[PDB]
Amino acid sequence: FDNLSRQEKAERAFLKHLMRDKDTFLNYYESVDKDNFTNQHFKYVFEVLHDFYAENDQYNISDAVQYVNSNELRETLISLEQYNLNDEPYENEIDDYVNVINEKGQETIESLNHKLREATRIGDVELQKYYLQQIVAKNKERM
């Protein structure tokens, strides 16, 4: 079964995050399932990025471009880089990323409320989202 899931779309999209912030590489690497979730995509990303991590660590387009014969999910990655975080709010990154991967639980439509409110709970427009949290109230009222 080729089960390239939406969670991998989150992998792919998370990598659009500015590659300066290699801490984010290591953070996403260890926060995720190294055991089962390790994708060939993830293997290649981890491996190359770790190689630079070992000496001088900034990963570029150029690297994936050297890969333009090979690992063409690298083209997909380049395609993500071509896609702009300009037209996207940065909440498309961490919020959606967490939401997509963590929705893969027992989280139903309303349980999505819990996590949305919880992710934003870091110091978001939560006055607005307090109202959203009324919707979240329905979620926690599911029981």
Side-chain angles (χ1 to χ4, degrees):
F1 281 74
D2 182 65
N3 189 87
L4 294 178
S5 184
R6 51 190 291 113
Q7 299 172 270
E8 295 89 289
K9 219 308 182 307
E11 280 186 65
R12 297 170 183 219
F14 215 46
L15 299 179
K16 189 188 304 182
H17 185 88
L18 300 185
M19 301 168 183
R20 301 183 180 239
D21 185 18
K22 295 302 309 308
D23 287 88
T24 290
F25 159 54
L26 183 64
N27 292 330
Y28 112 89
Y29 170 38
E30 298 183 275
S31 302
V32 85
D33 271 271
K34 303 168 68 186
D35 181 79
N36 176 84
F37 191 79
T38 186
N39 187 333
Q40 181 173 329
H41 168 256
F42 189 87
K43 177 285 198 298
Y44 276 79
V45 176
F46 159 83
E47 193 166 280
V48 184
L49 281 61
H50 187 106
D51 187 78
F52 292 98
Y53 216 116
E55 197 175 286
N56 65 273
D57 185 33
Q58 290 191 30
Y59 171 80
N60 295 150
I61 167 191
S62 318
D63 301 286
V65 167
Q66 294 177 328
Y67 281 119
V68 299
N69 293 33
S70 313
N71 304 93
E72 54 172 62
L73 51 287
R74 55 72 188 155
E75 182 180 85
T76 311
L77 183 61
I78 290 300
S79 183
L80 277 307
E81 183 182 76
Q82 174 60 31
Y83 279 106
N84 297 274
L85 291 175
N86 178 31
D87 57 274
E88 295 190 271
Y90 61 83
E91 290 79 22
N92 285 339
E93 299 178 86
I94 54 176
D95 168 275
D96 178 85
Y97 176 75
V98 172
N99 282 326
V100 169
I101 301 182
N102 196 149
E103 66 176 280
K104 206 295 188 59
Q106 294 69 31
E107 301 303 274
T108 326
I109 45 176
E110 36 47 70
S111 307
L112 307 181
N113 305 153
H114 178 107
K115 57 173 183 53
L116 207 175
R117 175 61 185 113
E118 190 177 275
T120 49
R121 192 182 181 185
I122 183 72
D124 186 60
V125 297
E126 299 172 78
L127 181 63
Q128 171 198 90
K129 296 189 181 66
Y130 186 82
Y131 182 84
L132 187 62
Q133 187 188 329
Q134 293 296 329
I135 288 68
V136 181
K138 175 194 73 285
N139 163 217
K140 54 86 178 190
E141 284 182 51
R142 69 173 290 168
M143 54 186 299

